[PDB]
């Protein structure tokens, strides 16, 4: 039947990978299709390096689909065609699992009495768009997700797996444009809303890695630095050379350094092109994390113009300027004074909190607390003799 | 080259006149129906009107007071064409400033009235005590889940 | 209304619950009156705990909306807070964290019905310590309200220090509500301030 | 039994997905659950039976004693299928369900199918054997679920809640392949086992 197909494969395939198709033959047969279910999983992670993931998937899909699970079908899916380069083959399958699943749903849900199979449904729906990106037809992809957002909205319960894909794919058409800012911000709910399930190598994560790194420098809007190091992705991957050399810009800008941020970007200013012809986005950002950053740690909420001319390395002129332009993104609004020097603020715009600022925050409500106790020390003392 | 003019002018910036002239004279400039035509080369010099006017609107906004001496170093004008710019554009309403003819300081302010002052200050404590009230239910809810 | 109920303090996750108790009773309550219907469970508390998420699951089967978890304090131990409320949400946690299903605080006051108020009316026969009366009333309040607050601000203190000293997860929603506290302090020295005591000697 | 009210466990899992009697394990379990009820019924008809989810980690009560089979046949198909089961948590719910009943002259027992083994540590289903029978619960368990290529964890079980007192043990062993499961249960003692004295 399927067993002469499986046997051919083998023949085929590399020594290391020749154990695995067996495995296959004897799950179907003793009909334990839980085993069955996992063990090709497996497959398609390990050898679409080999090319025999193409002839494999193909038996499987079109003769069990409701006899696997309902996540399992489009996971062998998503590997034979994420190494495809035809657009029209990535396109075609999608067509073909589709249909199974529609006309699927009309007989069983009525048998079964129970069982929804629309879930899987909408990754494929991320993957035809998917599709749509790599073959350079951006306008067709976005319709699709917007109508993908549509379904997720009246959903009561919607499983991790079926939202990270859709980011994924959301991500990747902002980093086209490239729109620092507008995947920054979609790749963070990727990265929070990533599955208990291993199936993802350290390798992916590493790509990954250096695109979040780069969007994070070159941004404006951008005054988290360690929300990158909150994920496994950038926190762990550091002992690389190339991710050596990037930890340390973000780490950099991080404690608002402008000694050891001149060291590092004059060497990558010729090593990376892109972060040259973005260089000066990048430069005033380092004055604008000492904007916030230092108006925040003291209890003062007014600065003079002299304080952040020293601090951030600049004319009383330019100091100026740096000034109008974070009340221009929100980064702090409030009054601008130069007859007065002062810019005396009314909203920090909420950001990182690390270990250090709850301490300042705790130690602050402390003395908070000490001058409400003594006010009340007071106010025990007049009036102790009447109250009613 | 369309683009970056729609976004200059929508965007809250600061920007200097013959640097924009410099950026849209071999672009912009030479675009017939528009400003390659001849009194449109007088729609060229309405450019600039409506920069300066763009840069008065948001630094008085975001500057209370600001010395006229600056003010004329950052619009690219002479003291006199100043003055006049300010007054037309408070006589149309939309902008209010006192500036001092012996050049001491312009204060883009409407001087803040003594009920709204003491109403925006009662307004910052009910949000400090709503703000502590709050929370105090979420340090509860996060240390029994530990 | 009460329901049939165990409680097991072996495992928080066995519990009894009567399902058919449920279906019978809004049968008859339609009949006495159709503007009630089921919108949720009220648990004796004080303690929340991630069991009762489960429990939530069960109730979500019978009302439309999130049911709401209506924690009434049985024990009089808080001296306010009779009612603390909470709805189960499900959403993506921040800081690399997963989807965690999670009871939100969603404010809640006593405020009576009409018809229940006539029956507030004739029990209340105290002379009420807080009731916002005569001059006298008001100054025991006065002081009343400062202790009130001193406390509250004591929690925010201690649960700032057990962060970084004994390591509680970090919530930013709390932490980012507390950005906003030092961003709406009164800064002395300003024309407002100034204008405050001299509306002082106004009044 | 004569005088015996019973709570089945339907076994949702991903064992039960795959198909060991027509037309999956799922759809063979309806048929037997409906076997059962009517059999028991007729050698006592006091007795009534309730149903309750093998599913998730908190099973859920689908059904109360009752005796329309209609009650317990439409929660057969409301469940979600796919999930898996908890055989120590089942023991404690089922065991409520024991408690809260019309009348306790009847027997307190538990009918659970297998299709799945345990997803839970072995330990604390000895411990809890001893509870079971303490308060006269005897555990009936199908096996067909754990000898697929299984190792048969379930012997030490019924070994330790067996103890003749009024209610005692069994352990219906069922081949593991097409037959029809309802067939097979019948073949097993279904209407002929008791508890000894």
Known sequence: ?????????????????????????????????????????????????????????????????????????????????????????????????????????????????????????????????????????????????????????????????????????????????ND???????????????????SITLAERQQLAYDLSISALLGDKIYNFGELLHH?????????????????LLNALTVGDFDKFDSLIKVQISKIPILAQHESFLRQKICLMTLIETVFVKNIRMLSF??????????????????????????????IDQVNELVTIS????????????????????????????????MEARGQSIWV | ???????????????????????????????????????????????????????????????????????????????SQTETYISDLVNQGIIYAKVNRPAKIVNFEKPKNSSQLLNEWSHNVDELLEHIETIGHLITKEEIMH | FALPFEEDEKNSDVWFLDHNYIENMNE??????????????????????????????????????????????????????????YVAIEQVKDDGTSTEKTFLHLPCTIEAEEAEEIGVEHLLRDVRDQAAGGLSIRLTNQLKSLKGLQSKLKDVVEYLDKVINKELPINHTILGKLQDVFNLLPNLGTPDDDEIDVENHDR | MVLEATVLVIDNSEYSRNGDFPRTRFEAQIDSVEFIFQAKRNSNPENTVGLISGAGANPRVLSTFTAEFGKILAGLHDTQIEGKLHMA????????????????????????????????????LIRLAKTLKKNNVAVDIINFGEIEQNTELLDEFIAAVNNPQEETSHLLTVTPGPRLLYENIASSPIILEEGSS
């Open chain 1, 232 to 248: 496994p992705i950038m926190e762990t991957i550091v002992n690389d050379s190339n991710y050596d050399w990037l930890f340390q």
């Open chain 2, 1 to 79: 080259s369309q683009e970056s003019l729609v976004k200059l002018f929508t965007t809250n910036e600061l920007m200097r006149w013959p640097i924009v002239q410099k950026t849209y004279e071999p672009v912009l400039n030479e675009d017939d129906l528009a400003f390659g035509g001849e009194a449109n080369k007088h729609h060229w010099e309405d450019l600039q009107k409506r920069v300066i006017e763009h840069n008065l609107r948001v630094i008085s906004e975001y500057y209370s007071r600001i010395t006229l001496l600056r003010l004329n170093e950052l619009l690219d004008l002479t003291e």
């Open chain 1, 180 to 198: 620092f800012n507008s995947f920054y911000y979609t790749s963070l709910l990727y990265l929070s809303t990533l599955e208990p399930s291993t």
């Open chain 3, 28 to 85: 008859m309550c339609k009949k006495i009156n159709a503007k009630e219907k089921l919108i949720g469970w009220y648990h004796s508390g004080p303690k929340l705990r991630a069991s009762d998420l489960k429990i939530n699951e069960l109730f979500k089967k019978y009302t439309q909306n999130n049911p709401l978890l209506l924690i009434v304090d049985v024990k009089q131990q808080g001296v306010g807070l009779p009612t603390d409320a």
């Open chain 1, 306 to 335: 002299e304080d952040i001319s020293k601090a951030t390395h600049l004319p009383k002129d330019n100091v100026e300027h740096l000034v109008m332009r974070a009340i221009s993104l929100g980064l702090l609004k409030g009054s």
């Open chain 4, 89 to 124: 948590t089942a023991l404690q719910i089922a065991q409520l369900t024991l408690k809260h009943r019309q009348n306790k002259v009847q027997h307190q027992r538990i009918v659970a199918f297998v299709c799945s083994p345990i997803s839970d540590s072995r330990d604390e």
């Open chain 1, 347 to 378: 909203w920090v715009q909420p950001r990182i909190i690390s270990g250090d600022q709850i301490t300042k925050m705790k130690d602050r409500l402390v003395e908070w607390n000490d001058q409400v106790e003594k006010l009340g020390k007071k």
């Open chain 1, 1 to 177: 039947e399927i067993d002469t197909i499986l046997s051919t494969l083998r023949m085929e395939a590399d020594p290391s990978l020749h154990p695995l198709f067996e495995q296959f033959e004897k799950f179907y047969e003793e009909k334990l299709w839980f085993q069955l279910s996992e063990s090709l999983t497996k497959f398609f992670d390990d050898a679409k390096s080999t090319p025999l993931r193409l002839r494999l998937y193909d038996n499987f899909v079109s003769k069990f689909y409701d006899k696997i699970n309902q996540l399992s079908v489009v996971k062998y899916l998503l590997a034979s065609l994420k190494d495809s380069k035809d657009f029209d083959e990535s396109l075609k399958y999608l067509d073909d699992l589709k249909a199974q699943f529609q006309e699927l749903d009309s007989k069983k849900q009525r048998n079964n009495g129970s069982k929804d199979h629309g879930d899987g449904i909408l990754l494929i729906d991320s993957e035809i768009a998917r599709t749509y990106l790599l073959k350079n037809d951006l306008v067709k992809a976005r319709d699709l997700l917007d109508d993908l957002e549509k379904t997720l909205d009246k959903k009561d319960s919607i499983p991790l797996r079926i939202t990270n894909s859709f980011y994924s794919t959301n991500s990747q058409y902002f980093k086209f444009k």
